[PDB]
Amino acid sequence: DPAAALEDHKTRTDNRSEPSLDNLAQQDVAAPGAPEGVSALSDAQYNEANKIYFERCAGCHGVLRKGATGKALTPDLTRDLGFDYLQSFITYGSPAGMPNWGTSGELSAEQVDLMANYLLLDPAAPPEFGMKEMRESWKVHVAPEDRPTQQENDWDLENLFSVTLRDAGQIALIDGATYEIKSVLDTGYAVHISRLSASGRYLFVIGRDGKVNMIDLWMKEPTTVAEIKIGSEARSIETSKMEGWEDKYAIAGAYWPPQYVIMDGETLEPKKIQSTRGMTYDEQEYHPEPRVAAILASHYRPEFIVNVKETGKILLVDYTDLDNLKTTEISAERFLHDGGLDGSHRYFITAANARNKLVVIDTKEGKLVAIEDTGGQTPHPGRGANFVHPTFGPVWATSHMGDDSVALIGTDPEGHPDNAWKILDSFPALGGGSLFIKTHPNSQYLYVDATLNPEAEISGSVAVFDIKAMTGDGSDPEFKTLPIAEWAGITEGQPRVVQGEFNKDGTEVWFSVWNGKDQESALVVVDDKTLELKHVIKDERLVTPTGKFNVYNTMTDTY
Amino acid sequence: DPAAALEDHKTRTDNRSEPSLDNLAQQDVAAPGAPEGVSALSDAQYNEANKIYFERCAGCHGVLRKGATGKALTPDLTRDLGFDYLQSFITYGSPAGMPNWGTSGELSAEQVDLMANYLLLDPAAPPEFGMKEMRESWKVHVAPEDRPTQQENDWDLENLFSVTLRDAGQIALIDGATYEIKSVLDTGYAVHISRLSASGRYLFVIGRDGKVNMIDLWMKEPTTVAEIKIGSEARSIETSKMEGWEDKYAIAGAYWPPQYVIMDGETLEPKKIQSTRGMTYDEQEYHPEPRVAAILASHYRPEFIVNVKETGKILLVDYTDLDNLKTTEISAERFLHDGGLDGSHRYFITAANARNKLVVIDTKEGKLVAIEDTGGQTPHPGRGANFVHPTFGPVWATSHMGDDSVALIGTDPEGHPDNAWKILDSFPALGGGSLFIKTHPNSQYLYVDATLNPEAEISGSVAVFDIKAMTGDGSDPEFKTLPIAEWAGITEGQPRVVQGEFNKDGTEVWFSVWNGKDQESALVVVDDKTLELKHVIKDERLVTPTGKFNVYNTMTDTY
């Protein structure tokens, strides 16, 4: 019955992070005709409903309504349910999106009826975005021959932090030692991720609207040297990291259209576009909207590592020959999202989040090695945290959005075979709603945020575990609670702390204290050796600070 | 100007061979709603129009109307053209289909209006056909363990011919020495191709409706031992031919849905389904309906060789690991259709027919090595004809649908380097409308049909060139004309002669004398040594005989 929406359409700590296609939602669409038994919506009503659908519903159900974490809502199925059921179900609203910018999920009576009617109509597919469109958007501001041949500024590039100023469509380049904002650059769109070329010279940023900017850190005044648009909705980018292939290529992954694009690493020239439309790995059924999620780069072969979410495929894409394109399509687990390489950089460990699994790929052999349930609800590692557990040996850790657990997986088949690819321990941190876990080789500490927790004090704090004290005896390791938001001294709202990131030396860890666009935010720097406050970064330009990426740690995959 | 249809839609010798989706056309479809400013069709009217569209138009314009050899006809474009233009254009009649069974391309006034209105409406995509559907259709009539362990009939299987009795959905198994019709087997819908497992035991047939049958030639009375449906429209099938992989797998290619399927070679169990939806190689634009055309099997690697037509991609699919699937996606040329391996079995030579090109792939190295224009219009080689030209060395030949030319390409990069992958000679045969060229290592003759020629004297005859008399002087080699239809002694609506196929020893070559379903047909056997009539096969059961496949020559790729 319609009351089942209380369990499936209310906000959880782990259902607020599905895609919001708010860039694609800005496109106007044509209202379709309605077959017998169905009523048409006017152009305005249909567009109003489409905008709501794309911003709030398509993340879980698809723009094409063929299903993602939520089931299919195609007209054959919804017409069988009928308007009355749909109206009653949708009256409850839908899950809230991310804090500070996402939807509340609340709908007016008029909006409820629009949505029920929209679901009974036949949707069109949004426009494709191919090579002609990419080349039209492709601009080389500074040709390679006109760029410097050596660093022409006096900055400490490897210790720089590239910080997303989300809602301002900017990034800040901040000195990792002095905390000086060296520059604020316009991207003109909200940036999701910063990634660095393997040499550390080129900074790549991708916006949620599919725009890519490439910045030359050697210029006297670093700026965008090239830009291109690669889709309508995108969230991932990466650079080539195989020895001998430094600075050769960049790759971007899109949600819409479902595709990835390999670009020249010096100019952003679009070289190869690959659709990710295809069959689910398990049921082997066609899926028309398999979004690209995280993208990593192999250190063992000249390949990109591409997660294809809805089909549960991990792609190893060999960039040595883009005409005779060699790929390995690895059947994994559905709902792949984020992940990272182990400490040796050989094995890719990724969360198939809605199925509570970690998938492990051997990037040297090009094959699946393991799939293990974490025992927690909805793992969300980011790139995760590699460390040497005093008892277990090399491990990789993840925290979870759906519960307070931290899980450890053994990552050393050669030296610790009995622990390899097994979940070795699971223990609580601050609370549900964690997004990022972090450590560094020079630190003895494991930091765990709780960004999406509904309790303000918890979402403004970070748990810190002492790795040296871990025994793996089955007890719950104690943790210190750092009052990060309190240290930032922000009076307004309930700012959420998110994502630890270390400096190059691994002696200081930064957190974003993230408030909304019209509120006060900060970055907080923690002294890793003492766990004491080192510095609070505030500036009128520091608007909605979210992701932070140290140049050295990002170029080298040190996590 | 709608009068452009006089040229655009004129029937030619080389535009009669685009797909007719007459199995998919049998599905009943409901009418879509009509947006404002568009008149709706009733369910009956829409279904009538849809059937015509799928049978006569979708081959060139696509079932989704995104274009194939003909341009896109999506509603954005057709509504700009308008009903009047569409009605006027379609009144002129469209290109005829194949002889004997294809459309005339003529429409009544009522049908013209149905088509113009159908083109203004928004089409749905026909149903997908995935693993669940394949498994529901999968039937193993005789389990492997219950089949013979040795040949239990006294037939000379290597000399057997498997002959398509087109319209009836049957095949005739005919003795290569006595010419006796040993058995006529029913499969339902028209069989397109017969292929043999590498051991010669199993005969695989693929129906145009996507039905695959596997027949055990070791039975006392050979019959289907397993069947499965792999799509709604399909034309290709092949077996694994790498040494060590005999009888391991079979692969089928579909037009709708756009996919290929790898099946167990003993049971037909469906193992891996791959979508062919993706980007065109050159302009790199998404194409929603890239049909699978010819499929061959590598003799150098454990791979299948799959032509993807509308995107111009040749896929090398490694079947040693179906979970960690390695493929090479080779950028080729659009409109790939048929082709064959050279005499050494290393290079795949295939016609990108609408662009008059031969594409050459090195199956050992997994890369494109050449793309050459034949100088002719619309090459159509079948698997082609390999021979050692007395002065040029190893060559492969193709004839053309659009003109009377025969082109020779050098196939020996190590031994005749300057000649390799170059068109070495071009010369006339009987006339345009050729479909198949043939030779055999034990013959000195090269046979060329002219099936689609408009003149009965030509379409009922075959040209035969003496390879031993070929010089490197640039002149045109003479040919002998064999009056194959006259030899059959049939007076019906100009039966057309098609496709030479040799017996196992290469001493006799068979041709089909193809007449309509309610008319008399024949097979004509020619003595290759004397170029004289040997025997005529006539039988009331021999209805619409077309493709003929000798077991030995098919199993070994001897052509």
Ligand code: DHE
């Ligand atoms: C696919 C994907 C990646 C992996 C990128 C890669 O491999 O390069 C990722 C990584 C990330 C990372 C990577 C951290 C790392 O250390 O690798 C961060 C900081 C991040 C901050 C946010 N993400 Fe992210 N994020 C999405 C998708 C993704 N986010 C969404 O679909 C989602 C849920 C909603 C949306 O429509 O955008 C979303 C919302 C957010 C935020 O609201 C965050 C917190 C702030 C912000 O700026 O938008 N996402």
Ligand code: DHE
């Ligand atoms: C993709 C394809 C192949 C390669 C198969 C492989 O590699 O296993 C092929 C091969 C073939 C071959 C392979 C000959 C060989 O020696 O390999 C033959 C004999 C053949 C006889 C016909 N074909 Fe064929 N044929 C189509 C497609 C194809 N035909 C069509 O789309 C088309 C044009 C129309 C349709 O809707 O089916 C079509 C009409 C015909 C005929 O009308 C023919 C002459 C008779 C018949 O039985 O239908 N096709």
Ligand code: HEC
């Ligand atoms: C992810 C967090 C969701 C968002 C955002 C929205 N929906 Fe959803 N929906 C989701 C689930 C988990 C379920 C239950 C079925 C399942 O997949 O497990 C649903 C169910 C519906 C239904 C009912 C369908 C049925 O067959 O009973 C409808 C009509 C529906 N959802 C619509 C819908 C709309 C309009 C949304 C935006 C306002 C929306 N959903 C958001 C998960 C998620």
Ligand code: HEC
């Ligand atoms: C292949 C042999 C064709 C078949 C079968 C049919 N059409 Fe076609 N069509 C074809 C060509 C080569 C062209 C010219 C444009 C190009 O792609 O080069 C066309 C054109 C049309 C048009 C005109 C569209 C315009 O923008 O002017 C229409 C409306 C059209 N064709 C419709 C159509 C229908 C209804 C058919 C079945 C009866 C049909 N075509 C068959 C090639 C081929």
